[PDB]
Structures are given as structure tokens and as C-alpha cells.
Amino acid sequence: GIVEQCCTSVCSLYQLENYCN
Amino acid sequence: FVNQHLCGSHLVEALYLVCGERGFFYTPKA
Numbered sequence: 287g288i289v290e291q292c293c294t295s296v297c298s299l300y301q302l303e304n305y306c307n
Numbered sequence: 308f309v310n311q312h313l314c315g316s317h318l319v320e321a322l323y324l325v326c327g328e329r330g331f332f333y334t335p336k337a
């Protein structure tokens with residue numbers, strides 16, 4: 287989930303926006 | 308600011324700024 291994608295690897299706007307409502 | 312490793316409240320605050328009025332979900336184990 288978001289921690290794997292943005293904390294343990296480099297985040298991106300695309301991935302953040304996957305978690306917007 | 309989004310293109311880095313973001314952990315804990317750092318990640319939460321990025322979500323808050325990017326998602327704006329859409330709001331968001333933070334599930335650090337899922």
C-alpha cells in the first residue's frame with residue numbers, strides 16, 4: 287500500500303493521488 | 308515535494324496537501 291510505495295520507496299504524485307477520496 | 312521518500316506524518320501531510328478537498332485515506336498496513 288502507500289507505505290511500500292512512498293516511504294520504503296520514492297513517492298510520486300500518481301501514487302499519492304491513488305489515495306485521495 | 309512529492310518525489311522523495313515520505314514516511315509517517317511527512318507522508319500524511321503530502322496526502323493532505325495534494326488531495327485537498329477530495330480528502331484521503333492513510334492505511335499504513337494495507
Ligand SMILES: [Ar]
Pocket residue numbers: 319320323
Ligand atoms: Ar497534515
